[PDB]
Each structure stands twice: as structure tokens, then as C-alpha cells.
Design a protein around this ligand. Structure first.
Ligand SMILES: [Cl-]
Ligand SMILES: [Cl-]
Ligand SMILES: [Co+2]
Ligand SMILES: [Co+2]
Ligand code: NA
Ligand code: NA
Lengths: 376, 376
């Protein structure tokens, strides 16, 4: 059923609340191939919050910190979560309708619609509360031709190391995953269906994704046109603690687990990300032997050199029409909370339970290294 | 008067409490030429605190974060200060004497002497409280031949970008500066004299270091053998706010303002630091014209090419026997608290009021950019 009005066009940006915005922006630029896009802070008249905005392709990350001692909201969030995602922004049409419908349906509107303006045009915003402390900012451009948004200026500094580093080829945000406490997958996913008129796109249960020790459940929600996809996970039964529970343990509650970044040349992307010093999970050699055998009878043909996929530890899954290439980074902070994913799609716009299982097992290895794969 | 017993050999290390230890270590390695030395965290059995230890020459920085939500001590310090220095460690002989004398003299002993042991030998430690929330850890090696200390293991990861970046040539910690609130310079410096049997090494007042708008006072304390030098600053009068007060405003109290790192090849160091993307303060062109004229009658001869010093914005000061080359970085976080300095000494083991004045003016320019050079 197509929503009567409104559209969620694409992910706009992801806002992180971090301990040191300057250093965080530096990390993502150096290690992951981002470049500075915009800035606000003391030098631009923003006296409570500093933000470094960085971009790669269509991907926009906003790294923000408090400027003053004893900031209650940002300081509490920092002590609770460590560095992590605060807001997932969507570019929309008809923000007014979307907010009114969401309110009538029971969503909490943290910030009522407001308009900001600069010499490049106007932008309308609204803020809704989703799971945990995570929010969604709705962004409706009203003939806006600026490079980012009102209230942000050119970058504080253009680091001269960045043009010397190899291009990472990341193009856009593919999906974003939210981990929930035990028995909160349904409520957190229903939020989207009820309030935003998203629909259920995919799901897996603990009979599909599990190791000998642990498991999860997941429901993926999507907007009508399926340009926005968000898996929602919860822990599920096993002899040992689910990695989704490890996340909740270290995050202090629900929150964003991973942001997946799409590329059209994953071999180049991962080679270059590794050259820049980014770490990824691993996969046993047996996996690639099994893959080569299974590919002999698959209806699809993988065009990437399997030797390169093996060397780079990329995971392959397929249906009868196309295939998916996926790899997870190690967590981007010491708490085992947030990490990122690189994904390439070949005539496949969904998810694969094979890759979900393989990725789950690769993460579980690290969970056990951390001493957190403990008997229930 | 030589202390009856005990010796403070050298700075051992500086411990930072930061929001994201992994990213911070990455910043210092990439931008400033450090390499990983050691690690403790979940994978090594340290379940409350993660630490990434990095080294360059004799310089050792320890970047630490809390691993769990709602860590009181580290979380409060993070919200109060942002990322910054928690502890300045000294390598000592006769830790027992030093602690007992300090206690008798009135110092607060945060942690009584204790011994840790591994297969490389034993190390004795003690912790004393200095200004603000800053502590000193005393480190006495007892036939210890390990690369760092007990309780830390090999690095979590050796980033493969680092060997590809140019060498920064930093050798050892030269001095560390503590900024105090109004009228606390004397008490904070006296702490060293009374408790540790340091002595006054140098001082300047607001008649020596000032611009048209602002000023400071400083007292430098040193150990008997003068291997350890620590300037202690306070704000002083002016039409506008002192940069030392700006620090206190943003730090929430007293704390470390800058760590100075010594090099024997400052031209190479600064060229390579700039290539890696580190930002430094600036100096007007007039300064170098004046310098060239003054050098015509100086008793010393500067061996570095003055054109290179000008291009790199290095500041020169001298007495009749030798000279000092100094440059400040921009702050290493968005709050204008901590920054670093690179220093080269040529037959000059003290400080120069000329350079102190020039460095003060260079910082004041940035303070004004931040909107913090406000009328008193
Ligand atoms: Cl099974
Ligand atoms: Cl004057
Ligand atoms: Co994913
Ligand atoms: Co200095
Ligand atoms: Na599109
Ligand atoms: Na020595």
C-alpha cells in the first residue's frame, strides 16, 4: 500500500556524537577515504557544539562534540555509549505530512518542523525519536543548492595527506543496522511501519542465523520505494551470549551497530582501505574452497577474481538472479559497539542469509577474543 | 641544595584520558610520527580500561578510555575536560623515599607504593595528586628489561600505512606546561618545591610576556639535575582575557596546556609533520625580516637556513651562548585546551622570553579567531 503523501528519498547523513570531533573526522578521512565537506564551531559562531562534516561519494558523516565542560545531553550520551551514532537523517519530500502522520500514529517529535535559510536557499527539518537515544532528522530541501546545509561553513582545514592516499571508491550508504535489547526487535521495527509507513522487507530467525553457540533474529524495514533499508536485530537463544547482547552490554542500550557503505569496485575498495590501515574481520580458508565448489552449479557467475576475494576476506552470497559481496570492519572504537561494512551488489537489492550467517560467525570469533562469548 | 635521597631521572610517559583510545592512538601515529608500542584491553584481560601505548624515540604516550558504560571517574573527567592529559609519569630512583618525603611535606598520595612483576622483572609505582585532576605516577624499574611495563601486551594492530609516512624525528619530552586558574601559579609551583624538592628554574611576569591586550605569568620548576622542566602558568592582567584563562574556561580547571617534544632536526621534523597533515600556528612575515637584522649583531650563529625556518613558521630566540627553535601546533581537539610543541636546542637548556612572547602572540591570534579574546 503506497503512502498517501510524502517520500523518503535517501539517507541524507549520519551524525555521530564523539569525544573528539577533530580526531574522529581525521580517522574517517585517513582510514576510510573521506574528505572534509563542512564545519561549524567557535570560529564560525557555534559556541556549544562543534561539527566536522566529511563526505565520500554521496556518504555524509557529521562528527560532533560538546565545546564546553559539563554538557549534560552530550556528556551523558558520551559516558553511556562512548563514541557512536546519534542521528540518522533522511532526505524527504513533504516533511510536514510525514511529521503529522507520525505524531497521529504515536511517534515522539523531539523537534517540531523548522526552516533554516542561507544564500543558497531554504531547508526544512524535523526530529523524531527512534530506538534508544537514536533520532531521525528529516531534511527537506526547498530549492537549496548549497554543498551541505545552512549553518555550516567551509572546512576548518584541508589535510594535505589525503590526496596522496589511494581512493576507496565508496559511493553511498546502503543500509544501517540497529541492535535492540532482548524482545525489542518487534517494537523497534513496528515503529517504522506504524509511524513512517515503512514496510517489512526481509527477516531471519535464529533457525537461519546461528553458530553452534549463539544466534540472533532480524527484521529489515524499508520505505515504500525501498531506497532506505534498516535491519533491526535482537539477541536470540543459544548456549552462549549473542553478539547482539554484547552490543547492548557495551552500548548501554539500543543503538546503531553498523553502517554499510556501497561500492561498485569492492576489490579496489578493500585493497585501498587495507593500505590506509583499516582492519577487517577474517574468514577461514575452507570457506573459499567451499565457495569455488558451490559456484560450479550456481545460476549466477561471479565476475570478480575469486583469488582476490579470498585474499581480501570478502564474503559472497547469491540467489538465482544475482549476488552480494560483503565485508565487515573491526569496531571503530574499543568498546565492541559500532563497525562498518562495505557491500557491492550485482543484480541483488536484498540480503542473503548465507552472508548473514558468515558475517555473524566472523563477528563471533572476535566476541570470543574479547571474553564475551560467555555461557548463558 | 641537593635532596638527601631519591632521583627523578626523566619523564617516563604521559597518560591521556580520551573518548576513543583507538582513534586517538591512530591520530598521534598518523599525524605526529608515533608507532604502537603496547596494548591492554578486553583481549588481554583488562576489562575496565583500554590503553593504546605509542612511542616515538623516548616519547611514550598512553591513550586510555573506559570500556564500560557509566564509568564514574573516567566519564566525569571526560565530560569535564574533553580529551586530555590525566597523568605525567616520572622514572625515579628511591620511590619509597620520594613518597614518604612528599607525604610528610603534605602531598596527597592517591595510590601507595606497589610492585608489579612479569617475566622481564619488577616495577614499583606510586601515584601523587598534583594540580587540577592531574596526577604523577612514579616509576621505579627494578631490573626491568621489558619494552614497556607489566600488564601491557604487544600492540593490538601494526598499521601498514605508518612505515610509508615520512619520519618526524621527535626524540624525547622536553617540558610539560600546566595552566592554573587566577592566583594559583604560586601554589601549584610550590607543590613541586615543597613536596618533591624541585627548585625554581625560570620565571617571567606580565611585564615580559604580553601583547597589547593580554598577558600571563609563569614559574618553571625543575628537579635537582634539571632533566625535568615544568612551566606553571596563570592568567595576568590585560584589557582582554588571557589565553591561560581561555584554557581554564574550556578545561574546567587546571591542567596540562602543552607537551613539548625535542628534535635534533627541526627543519625535517616540521616539513614531515606538515606532510602528514599536522597544523601549526603562524607568524607574520615581518618577524623574519626583524630576525635577519637582529642576527647580524648576535653573538651566536644560527646554522639552520633562515628561509626554511621562515617557510615552516619556526620561532628563534637566543642568549649569548646558544639558541632555541620552537613551534606550536594547533590544539589537538576542538576545545582550545591541549596542544604540542616541537623544540630544538643549540647549547641552550633554558627558555627565552623572546620566544615565549612570540608564541604567546601566535596563540592569541587563534584565541581571537575563536571569539575568546574578550574585554575584561
Ligand atoms: Cl546449525
Ligand atoms: Cl608592550
Ligand atoms: Co550489513
Ligand atoms: Co613550551
Ligand atoms: Na536516487
Ligand atoms: Na639521560
Amino acid at each position: 500500500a503506497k503512502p498517501e503523501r510524502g517520500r523518503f528519498l535517501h539517507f541524507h547523513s549520519v551524525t555521530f556524537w564523539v569525544g573528539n570531533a577533530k580526531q574522529a573526522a581525521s580517522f574517517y578521512c585517513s582510514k576510510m577515504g573521506f574528505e572534509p565537506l563542512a564545519y561549524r564551531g567557535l570560529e564560525t559562531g557555534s559556541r556549544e557544539v562543534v561539527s566536522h562534516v566529511i563526505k565520500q561519494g554521496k556518504i555524509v558523516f557529521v562528527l560532533s562534540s560538546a565545546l564546553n565542560p559539563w554538557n549534560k545531553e552530550m556528556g551523558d550520551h558520551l559516558v553511556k555509549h562512548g563514541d557512536g551514532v546519534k542521528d540518522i537523517a533522511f532526505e524527504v519530500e513533504d516533511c510536514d505530512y510525514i511529521v503529522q502522520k507520525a505524531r497521529e500514529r504515536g511517534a515522539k517529535i523531539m523537534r517540531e518542523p523548522w526552516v533554516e535559510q542561507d544564500k543558497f536557499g531554504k531547508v526544512k527539518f524535523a526530529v523524531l525519536q527512534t530506538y534508544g537515544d537514536t533520532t531521525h532528522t528529516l531534511v527537506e530541501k526547498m530549492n537549496y543548492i548549497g554543498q551541505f546545509l545552512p549553518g555550516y561553513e567551509a572546512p576548518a582545514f584541508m589535510d594535505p595527506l589525503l590526496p596522496k592516499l589511494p581512493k576507496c571508491s565508496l559511493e553511498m550508504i546502503d543500509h544501517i543496522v540497529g541492535n535492540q535489547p532482548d524482545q525489542e526487535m518487534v517494537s523497534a521495527s513496528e515503529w517504522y511501519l506504524k509511524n513512517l509507513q515503512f514496510h517489512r522487507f526481509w527477516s531471519v530467525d535464529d533457525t537461519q542465523v546461528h553458530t553452534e553457540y549463539s544466534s540472533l533474529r532480524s527484521i529489515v524495514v524499508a520505505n515504500y520505494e525501498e531506497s532506505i533499508k534498516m535491519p533491526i536485530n535482537e539477541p536470540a537463544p543459544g548456549k552462549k551470549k549473542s553478539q547482539i547482547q554484547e552490543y547492548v552490554d557495551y552500548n548501554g542500550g539500543a543503538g546503531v551497530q553498523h553502517i554499510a557503505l556501497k561500492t561498485e569496485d569492492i576489490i579496489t575498495a578493500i585493497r585501498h582501505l587495507r593500505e590506509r590501515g583499516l582492519e577487517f574481520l577474517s574468514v577461514p580458508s575452507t570457506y573459499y574452497k567451499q565457495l569455488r565448489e558451490k559456484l560450479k552449479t550456481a545460476k549466477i557467475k561471479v565476475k570478480e577474481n575469486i583469488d582476490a576475494l579470498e585474499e581480501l576476506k570478502i564474503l559472497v552470497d547469491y540467489d538465482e538472479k544475482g549476488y552480494l559481496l560483503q565485508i565487515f570492519t573491526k569496531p571503530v572504537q574499543d568498546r565492541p559497539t559500532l563497525f562498518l561494512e562495505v557491500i557491492q551488489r550485482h543484480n541483488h537489492q536484498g540480503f542473503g542469509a548465507g552472508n548473514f550467517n558468515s558475517l555473524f560467525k566472523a563477528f563471533e570469533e572476535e566476541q570470543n577474543l574479547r571474553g564475551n562469548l560467555t555461557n548463558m
